[PDB]
Each structure stands twice: as C-alpha cells, then as structure tokens.
C-alpha cells in the first residue's frame, strides 16, 4: 500500500526476525537511532524474544502500540487440551484463561516503558476487545487508564498524545514531588514516626 | 460597491577576464 514509505520519511524501520543474532543487531541499531535523534520504530511480536527481557526506557521507549490482543491460536490441540484440563481440575473457564493469557503478555509488553518516576510514555492498545479488559490489567495501569480513554478514535488519541507529550516536556516543580513521591532520609524518618 | 457606474448594456565581463588572466599568471609563477 505504501504506508512504510510514509513511515520511512520520519523514522527508521527495524523488524524482529527469527534469527536471534539478527534480532539483537536490530535492537542495537534501534537503540543507536533513538540515541542519535534520527528516530526509529521497532516491530516485534508480543510473545517474542524482545518482550521477554528487553526493556525500553527513556529515549528508547516513548510510545507502545499493542496491535490487537495477543491471543493464542485457539485451533491448537495442545492449548485445547490444557484448557479442558484446567476447566475440569481448577474450575477455570476456557475464555477466562485465554483472556488472562493474552492480557498477561499485553501487560508484560506495556510495562517495559518505565524505569523511574521521571520516565513517560503513551501506551495505546489498538483493538475493540480491550474496551472491556480494564479490570484485567494490572492495578497500576488500570488506575492510570481513565474512563474517557476506554474507547477512543485514532485522531482523538493522536490529539491526546500530542497534548500529553507537550505537558510532560515541561520542568517539574521540585516541591510537587519533594515528599509525596520521592522521600529523603528525613521524610522517611517522618513516615516511620507517624506510622509508629 | 458599484453604484455610481453607468448602467450595463450594449564591465563585469572584462573584470572576470582580467581576474582569470591574473590567476593564471599566479599559477604559472608558483609552478
């Protein structure tokens, strides 16, 4: 269709490949492109080698596009047998277990964006089926997921992303985090005294 | 607003040349 042509003008394209060495070299190239300001986009599999340990923080990870719920292949004999065994033994419904398995990998990929509290990012879940899975996401992500963002459009999400990045680009007031999110030794002692 | 209108109806070239000659002379002198 020519969409990759449009992407190429703004960022380099790195793609995960079955070869582990090639994937590692692609990761190195992506990090170099992110560091030098050229801008890069990395395509990977939610249940692949990148998501099982490679972490994207600060300059490396800014936006995460989860294209669809990473559902397993339903028409698999092994998975069907496992689902039946779980239903019979642990009384776990097949749909519940499948949704758990997919949401677990989605959250795994989502959580590779932040290292400290000064890191920021936009996490877009692009699928109509995420709209009812908020209760299944981790607590710290569900709390940050607002009710107005449960079902958005592409243009409105782009506008929100622009506004959010512009807001997060400003200097933080030290007093706003002096003793409410970052604690010094004196603040820790005060917390211990108040608790005791 | 067309109200008052009547109603409708029926030289540098020598400078460059001397520059080139002088630079050629310079190059010859150095060589």
């Amino acid at each position: 269709m020519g969409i990759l042509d449009e992407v190429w003008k703004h960022k380099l394209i790195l793609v995960e490949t079955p070869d582990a060495q090639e994937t590692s070299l692609a990761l190195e190239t992506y990090r170099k492109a992110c560091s030098n300001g050229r801008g890069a986009i990395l395509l990977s599999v939610a249940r692949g080698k990148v998501s099982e340990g490679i972490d994207f923080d600060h300059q490396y990870g800014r936006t995460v596009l989860m294209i669809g719920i990473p559902f397993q292949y339903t028409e698999s004999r092994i998975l069907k047998a496992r689902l039946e065994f779980m239903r019979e033994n642990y009384r776990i419904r097949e749909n519940d277990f499948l949704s758990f398995d997919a949401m677990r990998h989605a959250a795994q990929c989502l959580g590779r964006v932040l290292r400290g509290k000064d890191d920021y990012g936009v996490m877009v879940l692009a699928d109509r089926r995420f709209s009812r899975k908020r209760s299944q996401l981790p607590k710290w992500i569900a709390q940050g997921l607002s009710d107005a963002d449960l079902n958005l459009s592409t243009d409105m999400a782009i506008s929100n992303t622009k506004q959010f990045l512009r807001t997060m680009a400003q200097p933080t007031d030290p007093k706003d985090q002096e003793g409410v999110s970052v604690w010094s030794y004196e603040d820790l002692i005060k917390h211990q005294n108040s608790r005791k | 607003s067309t109200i008052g209108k009547t109603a409708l109806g029926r030289e540098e070239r020598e400078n460059e040349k001397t520059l080139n000659d002088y630079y050629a002379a310079l190059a010859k002198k150095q060589a």
Partner: protein, 356 residues
C-alpha cells in the same frame, strides 16, 4: 476567596523573585541564532504558521538583544534541505541581521533539518572569537527527527572542547539528542532545553534568552581587553568612511588611528580596536549589581506613610497589605512601582536619597 486566590498567586510568583544573587555573567557575547526551516515547520499549530511566527519573534529578539547587549555580536543560520545555510555573518550591526530576517521570511520552508550541520557551521563561525567572549548558540528546533551525515556525538564532544554553550527551544516534544546536547554542553545543567506551551510562553522564552548566562566557577577566562572611547565629530563637509567607503556627514574618530567610523559599537576597520561609548558599558551594570528583591510588609505591623515614597500615590485600602519595601532603605513602595523599579530602572530612589 477569589481575591485571596489572586493574592496568593502573586505571592507564589514573587517566591521565585525572592532568590536573587549577584552571579557572575559574561557581558561580551557571541550568539549564533539557528532557525529550523523544514517540512515540519509548515504545521498550523502556530498561526499563521510556525515559520512566520518564529521569524517575527526572531526579529523582535534581535531588536531586544542588541538593545540590552550593545557590545555583543550575532550571526544567523537556517536549516533547509538537510543543509545549514548562513544568512548573516557575525557582526555588531543589528540592521544587517534585521534585513537578513526580512529576506528570510519570504522563502517557503522545506526539507529536513540537520542539527550536526548547523552545529558544525556554528563552531566554524565561532572559531574566530576572543577567549574573553562567551560563545553561545540559540537553536529554534521544531522537528522531532534529525538527519545528519556524520556522528552527532563527536560534534557534541567538539563543542564541549570548544567551550560553546547551546540553548534549544523546542515546539512539540523533547528530543533525546537535544536534551543530551543541552545537558553535556552546560556542565550537566538540564534547564537549557525548553519546550514551549503557547505563543505567549514562546515570547517569554525568547525574552529570557536575551539576558547573559552566568559563567561557571571552574571556567576562568579573566583578562583585560583593550578598548577605546572615540569622540564624536561634527564636520561641515561629507567625508569617506573607513568602514563602508561611503560618504557620511559625520562619524566617530578612533583615538588610536584617527580613522572615522559610521556607527558604534564596532571593531575599528584599521587598528582592529573595539570602539564603544560609556553608555554601552553602563547598560550592563545592573547585571553585576542586581537590586535586591522587595518583600511585602505584613498587615500586623504599622505602616510608615499613607502615600508611595517614589510616586506619591495613595495606597489602596480594603485584607492583604498592598505594600512592598526595600530592605536596604526600608521605604514602602506600591505594587505599580515595584515592577517598574525591578524591570525598567535599576536603582532604588530611597537608597539613593538616603545620605551616609
């Protein structure tokens, strides 16, 4: 509670102004203004467009910069088609830069920006500058990506070696390389990478860029510079000027070679001596002896006079005392005066009037 909200907001605003110290600042500056003219600058987020608004604010910035830094110099570079184009050589004449910007405003921006190319050109332009001057580069970046032919990290290291200082003003979002540049080039300070939120904040940032930057303690370049103060001459007949080779009614006579110069301050075209007037130096004394901030008087204590000392105006009567005092002389001042004495004037009338 709305009026009290306004009062507390004013107090919070004054909180930052409270902390003022006589930091050492480099009055003699050599600035390289790099502007971004790329496809990303055709957006309509700033009306009528980013290029138009940025050029207009650049013109105003040039006027203010040469108003408040008479003995500084500026140069103009732009980024177009992935290349750095010089449009104004380093000089002390504000009119040349203003005309250069007026010429730039016409051409439509296109292509990609090249921070490495712009930085290399700025380094080349700042190479022939005395060691006593402060080399600065103000970049107005608007794109979110950079296309460069070489290694940007090497250029950053070269800039750090050359002791150049870089300020970057963004438009949309932070760029990692821009942050690294502004941090590593300013001894780790991270406050020199600013992203605007609106047109008014962009104007405020441009105005903030005018004032000289404080120097680092470990970066010592103390020295004495040979400068001369010429005497204005009034002649009956026009004479040839030694700077532009054009007839002018009169010009300042250099005290070291007697050659005449059209306008000041400029380096003498014959003896390579800087010619300045006493007022040009006087314009920077407030950067070396800043006036201490004024603290409002609590309503609990008793006031001195019912009218302002400086302007003889009745103090408004209503919750919060509308009085500001100078600790040096202890003279009550009204809110209207305080801003004038701390923005336009630089001397306290009470301190001046008090004998010793």
């Amino acid at each position: 509670a709305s009026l009290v909200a306004s009062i507390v907001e004013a107090r919070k605003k004054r909180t930052a102004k409270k902390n003022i110290t006589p930091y050492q600042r480099g009055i003699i500056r050599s600035l390289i203004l790099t502007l971004d003219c790329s496809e990303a600058m055709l957006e309509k987020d700033l009306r009528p467009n980013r290029h138009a608004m940025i050029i207009q604010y650049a013109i105003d910035f040039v006027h203010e910069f040469f108003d408040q830094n008479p003995i500084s110099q500026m140069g103009i570079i732009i980024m177009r088609n992935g290349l750095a184009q010089l449009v104004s050589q380093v000089s002390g004449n504000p009119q040349d830069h203003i005309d250069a910007l007026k010429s730039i405003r016409k051409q439509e921006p296109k292509g990609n920006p090249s921070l490495q190319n712009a930085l290399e050109m700025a380094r080349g332009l700042l190479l022939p500058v005395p060691a006593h001057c402060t080399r600065e580069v103000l970049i107005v970046f608007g794109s979110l990506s950079t296309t460069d032919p070489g290694d940007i990290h090497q250029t950053i290291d070269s800039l750090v070696s050359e002791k150049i200082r870089v300020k970057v003003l963004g438009l949309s979002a932070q760029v990692a390389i821009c942050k690294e540049l502004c941090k590593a080039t300013n001894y780790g300070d991270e406050s020199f990478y600013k992203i605007l939120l609106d047109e008014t904040h962009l104007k405020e940032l441009f105005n903030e860029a005018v004032t000289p930057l404080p120097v680092n303690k470990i970066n010592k370049g103390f020295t004495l510079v040979k400068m001369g103060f010429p005497t204005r001459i009034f002649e009956d007949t026009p004479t040839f000027c030694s700077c532009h080779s054009k007839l002018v009614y009169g010009g300042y006579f250099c005290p070291n070679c007697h050659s005449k110069v059209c306008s000041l301050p400029t380096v003498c075209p014959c003896c390579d001596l800087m010619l300045i007037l006493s007022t040009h130096l006087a314009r920077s004394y407030h950067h070396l002896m800043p006036l201490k901030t004024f603290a409002e008087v609590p309503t609990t204590e008793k006031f001195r006079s019912e009218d302002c000392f400086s302007c003889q105006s009745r103090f408004p009567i209503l919750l919060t005392s509308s009085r500001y005092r100078c600790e040096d002389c202890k003279q009550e001042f009204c809110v209207d005066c305080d801003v004038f004495i701390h923005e336009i004037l630089h001397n306290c009338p009470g301190c001046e009037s008090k004998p010793v």
